[PDB]
């Protein structure tokens with residue numbers, strides 16, 4: 277039965293850990309956001325076919341450019357994430373994440389994931405960004421970025437509401453089959 | 454409350470890390486050193502290259518560090534000192550990371566399904582590769598937990614900043630040591 281290594285990369289601001297915890301436990305962790313998500317595997321059925329999905333977190337490694345690639349080899353699919361309410365994390369897709377992922381795993385599929393979808397319509401978030409002469413990242417921006425990096429899908433999700441979250445991972449699997 | 458949750462995570466994740474290294478050592482490592490099973494010649498007597506100094510890292514955590522962290526359970530604002538105390542021992546993460554690429558190449562090029570067979574046999578969710586990234590993960594994680602403590606511990610927080618300093622400096626040193 278088919279094994280799938282999925283590595284999740286992106287800035288600290290994406291909430292990689294929270295994402296994975298919320299997907300795996302079926303619930304936003306709420307009270308306390310743990311900093312530790314240990315390498316995970318579970319069976320899921322996709323398009324009928326059952327599959328063994330491996331998830332690796334990378335949080336903590338954001339400042340260690342030579343340590344991060346230690347997780348890259350033999351990856352079946354990357355989730356490259358940015359927070360939809362951080363223009364900087366978006367720009368880093370282009371500036372930092374796509375380059376090193378391509379440099380090490382040139383023929384590995386990428387899903388581009390916009391996180392914190394629930395904050396894109398939040399007045400306080402919106403206002404905190406307008407004060408910095410910025411706005412949240414909207415859909416066509418994600419699409420355009422995905423095109424530019426050769427991402428197979430651009431997907432948006434919330435660890436909070438679970439909106440789009442199961443789909444992110446369905447599609448990570450579909451991109452390998 | 455937040456300081457208590459973080460400490461609890463530090464402790465629970467430390468326990469699991471010790472469990473995970475132990476598991477690695479007594480499955481993937483033990484099969485090779487045992488001499489119970491058929492060992493691909495491309496890796497024979499190269500367990501040094503595969504597992505680097507993971508034994509010594511496990512021994513640190515299992516003999517000392519976990520016991521000392523436990524002592525700081527009700528002292529989250531002071532746990533930074535634990536890292537200061539035991540800083541030199543963390544230098545062995547530099548050696549480990551330096552070696553990890555060589556470990557990975559070796560396993561691709563010469564190990565075939567040796568370790569997969571062992572994984573299947575023992576019923577392990579984690580592959581040998583999943584176990585072997587863990588030291589790299591763990592050594593970048595401690596700084597996260599210390600930063601989290603800092604967001605919620607008062608001006609009694611130089612007993613964290615030095616701890617954090619240490620745990621920022623170990624992974625940077627490991628980073629800067631890579632080819």
Ligand SMILES: CCN(CC)CCn1ccc2cc(NC(=O)Nc3cc(C)on3)ccc21
Nearest residue numbers: 290291292294295391392393433434435436
């Ligand atoms: C203004 C600061 N807020 C704290 C964030 C305060 C209000 N608030 C509290 C928790 C919380 C949580 C979300 N939303 C998420 O974390 N979405 C995620 C994460 C990932 C990954 O993907 N989606 C929104 C608002 C919230």
